[PDB]
Design a protein around this nucleic acid. Structure first.
Ligand SMILES: [Mg+2]
Ligand SMILES: [Mg+2]
Ligand SMILES: [Mg+2]
Ligand SMILES: [Mg+2]
Ligand SMILES: [Mg+2]
Ligand SMILES: [Mg+2]
Ligand SMILES: [Mg+2]
Ligand SMILES: [Mg+2]
Ligand SMILES: [Mg+2]
Ligand SMILES: [Mg+2]
Ligand SMILES: [Mg+2]
Ligand SMILES: [Mg+2]
Ligand SMILES: [Mg+2]
Ligand SMILES: [Mg+2]
Ligand SMILES: [Mg+2]
Ligand SMILES: [Mg+2]
Ligand SMILES: [Mg+2]
Ligand SMILES: [Mg+2]
Ligand SMILES: [Mg+2]
Ligand SMILES: [Mg+2]
Ligand SMILES: [Mg+2]
Ligand SMILES: [Mg+2]
Ligand SMILES: [Mg+2]
Ligand SMILES: [Mg+2]
Ligand SMILES: [Mg+2]
Ligand SMILES: [Mg+2]
Ligand SMILES: [Mg+2]
Ligand SMILES: [Mg+2]
Ligand SMILES: [Mg+2]
Ligand SMILES: [Mg+2]
Ligand SMILES: [Mg+2]
Ligand SMILES: [Mg+2]
Ligand SMILES: [Mg+2]
Ligand SMILES: [Mg+2]
Ligand SMILES: [Mg+2]
Ligand SMILES: [Mg+2]
Ligand SMILES: [Mg+2]
Ligand SMILES: [Mg+2]
Ligand SMILES: [Mg+2]
Ligand SMILES: [Mg+2]
Ligand SMILES: [Mg+2]
Ligand SMILES: [Mg+2]
Ligand SMILES: [Mg+2]
Ligand SMILES: [Mg+2]
Ligand SMILES: [Mg+2]
Ligand SMILES: [Mg+2]
Ligand SMILES: [Mg+2]
Ligand SMILES: [Mg+2]
Ligand SMILES: [Mg+2]
Ligand SMILES: [Mg+2]
Ligand SMILES: [Mg+2]
Ligand SMILES: [Mg+2]
Ligand SMILES: [Mg+2]
Ligand SMILES: [Mg+2]
Ligand SMILES: [Mg+2]
Ligand SMILES: [Mg+2]
Ligand SMILES: [Mg+2]
Ligand SMILES: [Mg+2]
Ligand SMILES: [Mg+2]
Ligand SMILES: [Mg+2]
Ligand SMILES: [Mg+2]
Ligand SMILES: [Mg+2]
Ligand SMILES: [Mg+2]
Ligand SMILES: [Mg+2]
Ligand SMILES: [Mg+2]
Ligand SMILES: [Mg+2]
Ligand SMILES: [Mg+2]
Ligand SMILES: [Mg+2]
Ligand SMILES: [Mg+2]
Ligand SMILES: [Mg+2]
Ligand SMILES: [Mg+2]
Ligand SMILES: [Mg+2]
Ligand SMILES: [Mg+2]
Ligand SMILES: [Mg+2]
Ligand SMILES: [Mg+2]
Ligand SMILES: [Mg+2]
Ligand SMILES: [Mg+2]
Ligand SMILES: [Mg+2]
Ligand SMILES: [Mg+2]
Ligand SMILES: [Mg+2]
Ligand SMILES: [Mg+2]
Ligand SMILES: [Mg+2]
Ligand SMILES: [Mg+2]
Ligand SMILES: [Mg+2]
Ligand SMILES: [Mg+2]
Ligand SMILES: [Mg+2]
Ligand SMILES: [Mg+2]
Ligand SMILES: [Mg+2]
Ligand SMILES: [Mg+2]
Ligand SMILES: [Mg+2]
Ligand SMILES: [Mg+2]
Ligand SMILES: [Mg+2]
Ligand SMILES: [Mg+2]
Ligand SMILES: [Mg+2]
Ligand SMILES: [Mg+2]
Ligand SMILES: [Mg+2]
Ligand SMILES: [Mg+2]
Ligand SMILES: [Mg+2]
Ligand SMILES: [Mg+2]
Ligand SMILES: [Mg+2]
Ligand SMILES: [Mg+2]
Ligand SMILES: [Mg+2]
Ligand SMILES: [Mg+2]
Ligand SMILES: [Mg+2]
Ligand SMILES: [Mg+2]
Ligand SMILES: [Mg+2]
Ligand SMILES: [Mg+2]
Ligand SMILES: [Mg+2]
Ligand SMILES: [Mg+2]
Ligand SMILES: [Mg+2]
Ligand SMILES: [Mg+2]
Ligand SMILES: [Mg+2]
Ligand SMILES: [Mg+2]
Ligand SMILES: [Mg+2]
Ligand SMILES: [Mg+2]
Ligand SMILES: [Mg+2]
Ligand SMILES: [Mg+2]
Ligand SMILES: [Mg+2]
Ligand SMILES: [Mg+2]
Ligand SMILES: [Mg+2]
Lengths: 96, 122, 82, 99
RNA sequence: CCCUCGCCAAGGAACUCUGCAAGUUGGCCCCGUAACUUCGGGAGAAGGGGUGCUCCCUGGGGUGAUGAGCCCCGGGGAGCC
RNA sequence: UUGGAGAGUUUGAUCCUGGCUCAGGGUGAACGCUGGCGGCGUGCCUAAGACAUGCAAGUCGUGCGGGCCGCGGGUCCGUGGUCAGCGGCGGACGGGUGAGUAACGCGUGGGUGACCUACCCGGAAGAGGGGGACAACCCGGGGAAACUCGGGCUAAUCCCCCAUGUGGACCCGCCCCUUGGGGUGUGUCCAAAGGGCUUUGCCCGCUUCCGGAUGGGCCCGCGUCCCAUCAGCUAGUUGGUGGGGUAAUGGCCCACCAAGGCGACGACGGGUAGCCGGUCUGAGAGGAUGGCCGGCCACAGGGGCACUGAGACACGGGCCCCACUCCUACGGGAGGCAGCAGUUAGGAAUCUUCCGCAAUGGGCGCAAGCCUGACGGAGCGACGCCGCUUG
RNA sequence: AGCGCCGGCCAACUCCGUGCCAGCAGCCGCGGUAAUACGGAGGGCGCGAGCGUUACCCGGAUUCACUGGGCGUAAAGGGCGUGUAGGCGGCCUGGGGCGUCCCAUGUGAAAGACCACGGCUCAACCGUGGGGGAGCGUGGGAUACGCUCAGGCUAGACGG
RNA sequence: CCGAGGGUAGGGCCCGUGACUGGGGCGAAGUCGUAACAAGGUAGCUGUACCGGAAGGUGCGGCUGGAU
């Protein structure tokens, strides 16, 4: 009727709340920049995409994201903005 | 308001799932049983290898009724089903669990063991 | 981590450890990477300890960590000498 | 080494994928006689360049799909429609083994 | 009180010679469907899901001219009470 | 070339055919009769039925703030424990079991230009600024208890922001190579933590990148039982395009497109079964088997699920549904021995609620050390082999 | 110091009792009034802290026969054709090298097994060393036979 | 959205069980007849068919594993 396993569980929730919070923003700020790119609206898309890049890697600093998950998440974020902006171009500002 | 022919769910783990009242054990000629009354019933549907089988003539006590029962405080209570718990000739439940809520009237009628096994007394 | 360990053999009241490099999490008498010597803590026979020192230096050089008793059996064999 | 096998394209009816029918001979582990056995492989053809009767070589590649674990390597011989006829006749003969 | 008709708590054939009478079920579209069989059937077996309205996208036919318009068969997506 | 024995029984008698039977060896055995000792093995093969009680995983005060108690004085501080709390690391190892699985599960040989790996080792480079919360604690409510919610305070190797970029990542280019391998340039993006002593000095820690090493994931050829009185099977079904997902390939998952995939070389179905090193037999070939030991896999009351994390979809972690059981003050609550002993049930049948961490080994720690039913030993059983006695 | 056994197989025999009873029995079989076969006893044979039994695996079983069997009458030729798949296939030359053979090399964990030596007084148990393969990966080689491809023949086969 | 599972309805496979019923194996000394073994007193066997308390009988065609 006890353990140090109960402490590992109390901690797992402090981290779960923290990991879910970071992923929510990553998906929000990223998708936000992909809609903006489709409109394009390039300075606005790229000004947001960069904060989506920053949040991604800042998550890989710890346990929220593996290095490769972030690098793959970054790869698809940028790749979608390129083609989307190829229609109705003008990439200004710059981020690639 | 249970009478002969009335089907009742079985709110225990005896093995029986549906029983059909064949007698109201409350005098010479009671028309109806409510909660706390004992009936005699045949078992119409059992699950395999439970204590009671289909074809058994058992006693049970009604624990839930769809006809609302009235109380001296001016209130009433009604359940979605008609349900009973199977007993022996000592008011004691023949199973070890009671499923679903039961009426508080059972306590006054001396079906205490059922009241305790029930997950909610309303 | 890789560790340098004594996996007991022999029989009851009859110890005979093997000088073995094995994973830190492998069970004691389980499968090991290499056998680099042996040991007879009672010294009942002339050569109770022997060590392939050239090999024990490799695993020491590549990461493996000894035990507080395996270490004294590689120092007793001069794996650490100058 | 990535296993390399040689077989024949028995069915090209898919997009970017052909069916390569490979045979292999070996002695019976008890009766010593040499016996033939066969196996079909779904092989990748991203250029849809391979047709029925081609005698191709496949190389053990990374999964393209469930069951697709070989890429077609090189054409060795074209037009061996005699082998595909041995295959289809065998399959057609199966309706004769029914109840 | 009778006729014809509507509704009913809890029960649900306990009615009665008999579920008599009356409920239930009920069209269309789709899914699906048993013993047995003379291979047709049994079959609408059973059992289920769907059904209004709005906007948007779209496939074929008839008339016409190949088009518009009128008209007939559909398909997909998103909504509303 | 180290290896090969047969006999009884059909007839009045014979020869042949053929079945039954026997002599041998073996067992996790059991049963009867009998029973002295020692050693080393070994002992729930059935109900993966149900379980009383204890124990089987913790550790760091050299990360941090605290309540207590004891020690030296100035009711303030050092210090020693001590207790819970926050923060580390371990808890994914080790230990059990054989249910399920006829499968890339296992064996064997290979693939990864489709991949991850904490701690360990080696090489490169760095630690500069600022802020914040939550438990402990105080205050309030509820309760039999399990035990909570409320408000407010507070530290840190906890948490964010800025900076620096040795460096790495990503996108678009060119170069080598050739499945996503390696280079480089432009843009963008990401580092941190401090603690101890003897102190212009070490030590344990921290951060980013590379390599090693070990441990894995995934994929493929091949091998793997009985029934054909199971002969046809298939809609995520087979392939394609796009995407989601992951460390990573893939129908693994989703949309749409195409009409495919499989099968007498036995598909599909039904039965049984964890598989191998090996074990037992055998002249060999072969047959039988997979307990002990080692490797791998699978499961942790029956199912589903994810979270935390290098790593689990986690036996002694969490959520939910079911079956069962238990406490209760009757309002409500709890549990998961296929860990080690032990109990009960079933069965022809299968052990001590023992001892110690001294050894080996594991975890944490600067270290003294602490935990360790792993283990090392002791106990019961002619169960087995070996040795010994009753002269 | 006990347990099994003493008709043949199969090692060990007499007396009594019983009288198709009581019983034995792995098989063939024993017992119906002189039983080495039932029961006891004497004696004897085999083992010995064991000895018997039951269950099960392999062997004997060449009784699933690859090694290593059969089918007129013992069990066994399909009632007979035709033909699909499949198995198998004449003589000569060459190209390849799939089978097949050889050499090299990697893998084949530890334990076990086997041989040598040693430690527990021996042994069981245990340590240390030695020696191997098959199978598969790779590199090199051989080409008789089997395979394939190509060319020629006429003895099989088919046609005039 | 998926989703353990719960519910409703309809199939398939297997196991056990059932009044009664079919024949089968076995069982020291039952009852009936005598089919087969000799030319077994009707040569036998045979596929089929029909009949009869029972073996069997008879038809058709076939075999010699039929005697003299
Ligand atoms: Mg959002
Ligand atoms: Mg990371
Ligand atoms: Mg209920
Ligand atoms: Mg119930
Ligand atoms: Mg029952
Ligand atoms: Mg019934
Ligand atoms: Mg009851
Ligand atoms: Mg209650
Ligand atoms: Mg001892
Ligand atoms: Mg491991
Ligand atoms: Mg109405
Ligand atoms: Mg009304
Ligand atoms: Mg009514
Ligand atoms: Mg009603
Ligand atoms: Mg009703
Ligand atoms: Mg009803
Ligand atoms: Mg009626
Ligand atoms: Mg009536
Ligand atoms: Mg009546
Ligand atoms: Mg009438
Ligand atoms: Mg009517
Ligand atoms: Mg109506
Ligand atoms: Mg209607
Ligand atoms: Mg009507
Ligand atoms: Mg039908
Ligand atoms: Mg039916
Ligand atoms: Mg019917
Ligand atoms: Mg009918
Ligand atoms: Mg009918
Ligand atoms: Mg018919
Ligand atoms: Mg018919
Ligand atoms: Mg029909
Ligand atoms: Mg039909
Ligand atoms: Mg009808
Ligand atoms: Mg209908
Ligand atoms: Mg219909
Ligand atoms: Mg309907
Ligand atoms: Mg609809
Ligand atoms: Mg609608
Ligand atoms: Mg309307
Ligand atoms: Mg007209
Ligand atoms: Mg028109
Ligand atoms: Mg509404
Ligand atoms: Mg005889
Ligand atoms: Mg005879
Ligand atoms: Mg005789
Ligand atoms: Mg014989
Ligand atoms: Mg004694
Ligand atoms: Mg067991
Ligand atoms: Mg048990
Ligand atoms: Mg049971
Ligand atoms: Mg303890
Ligand atoms: Mg502490
Ligand atoms: Mg198993
Ligand atoms: Mg088993
Ligand atoms: Mg199966
Ligand atoms: Mg496999
Ligand atoms: Mg494999
Ligand atoms: Mg970790
Ligand atoms: Mg609080
Ligand atoms: Mg920064
Ligand atoms: Mg799939
Ligand atoms: Mg789909
Ligand atoms: Mg389609
Ligand atoms: Mg095949
Ligand atoms: Mg099974
Ligand atoms: Mg099993
Ligand atoms: Mg033999
Ligand atoms: Mg096996
Ligand atoms: Mg076993
Ligand atoms: Mg499970
Ligand atoms: Mg259990
Ligand atoms: Mg389970
Ligand atoms: Mg569970
Ligand atoms: Mg698991
Ligand atoms: Mg755990
Ligand atoms: Mg447990
Ligand atoms: Mg509650
Ligand atoms: Mg609760
Ligand atoms: Mg719970
Ligand atoms: Mg016990
Ligand atoms: Mg018992
Ligand atoms: Mg210790
Ligand atoms: Mg202890
Ligand atoms: Mg004897
Ligand atoms: Mg003998
Ligand atoms: Mg003799
Ligand atoms: Mg026997
Ligand atoms: Mg006499
Ligand atoms: Mg006589
Ligand atoms: Mg006599
Ligand atoms: Mg006898
Ligand atoms: Mg005898
Ligand atoms: Mg005698
Ligand atoms: Mg045998
Ligand atoms: Mg044999
Ligand atoms: Mg036989
Ligand atoms: Mg032969
Ligand atoms: Mg023979
Ligand atoms: Mg014959
Ligand atoms: Mg013939
Ligand atoms: Mg025929
Ligand atoms: Mg042919
Ligand atoms: Mg041929
Ligand atoms: Mg030839
Ligand atoms: Mg070759
Ligand atoms: Mg080897
Ligand atoms: Mg070996
Ligand atoms: Mg040894
Ligand atoms: Mg050895
Ligand atoms: Mg479902
Ligand atoms: Mg369901
Ligand atoms: Mg439920
Ligand atoms: Mg008589
Ligand atoms: Mg006659
Ligand atoms: Mg006669
Ligand atoms: Mg005659
Ligand atoms: Mg006659
Ligand atoms: Mg006749
Ligand atoms: Mg006649």
């Amino acid at each position: 009727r006890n353990l140090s396993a109960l402490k590992r569980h109390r901690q797992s929730l402090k981290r779960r709340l923290r990991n879910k919070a970071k992923k929510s923003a990553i998906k929000t700020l990223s998708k936000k920049a992909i809609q903006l790119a489709q409109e394009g609206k390039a300075e606005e898309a790229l000004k947001i995409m960069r904060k989506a890049e920053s949040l991604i890697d800042k998550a890989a600093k710890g346990s929220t994201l593996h290095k490769n998950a972030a690098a793959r998440r970054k790869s698809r974020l940028m790749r979608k903005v390129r083609q989307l902006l190829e229609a109705a171009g003008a990439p200004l500002i710059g981020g690639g | 308001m249970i009478q002969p022919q009335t089907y009742l769910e079985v709110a225990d783990n005896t093995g029986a799932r549906k029983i059909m009242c064949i007698r109201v054990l409350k005098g010479s000629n009671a028309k109806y049983a409510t909660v706390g009354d004992v009936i005699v019933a045949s078992v119409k549907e059992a699950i395999p290898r439970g204590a009671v089988k289909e074809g058994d003539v058992v006693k049970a006590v009604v624990v839930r009724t769809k006809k609302e029962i009235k109380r001296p405080d001016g209130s009433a209570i009604r359940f979605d089903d008609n349900a009973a718990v199977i007993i022996n000739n000592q008011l004691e439940p023949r199973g070890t669990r009671v499923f679903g809520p039961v009426a508080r009237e059972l306590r006054e009628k001396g079906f205490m063991k059922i009241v305790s096994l029930a997950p909610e007394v309303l | 981590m890789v560790k340098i360990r004594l996996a007991r053999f022999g029989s009851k009241h009859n110890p005979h450890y093997r000088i073995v490099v094995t994973d830190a999490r492998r069970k004691r008498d389980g499968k090991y990477i290499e056998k680099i010597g042996y040991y007879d803590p009672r010294k009942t026979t002339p050569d109770w300890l022997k060590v392939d020192v050239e090999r024990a230096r490799y695993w020491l050089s590549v990461g493996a960590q000894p035990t507080d008793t395996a270490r004294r059996l590689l120092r007793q064999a001069g794996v650490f000498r100058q | 080494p990535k296993k390399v096998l040689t077989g024949v394209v028995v069915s090209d009816k898919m997009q970017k994928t052909v069916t390569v029918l490979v045979e292999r001979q070996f002695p019976h582990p008890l009766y010593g006689k040499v016996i033939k056995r066969s196996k079909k492989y779904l092989a990748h053809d991203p250029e849809e360049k391979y047709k029925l009767g081609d005698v191709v070589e496949i190389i053990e590649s990374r999964p393209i799909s469930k069951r697709k674990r070989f890429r077609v390597l090189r054409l060795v011989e074209s037009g061996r429609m005699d082998l595909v006829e041995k295959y289809l006749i065998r399959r057609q003969n199966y309706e004769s083994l029914s109840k």
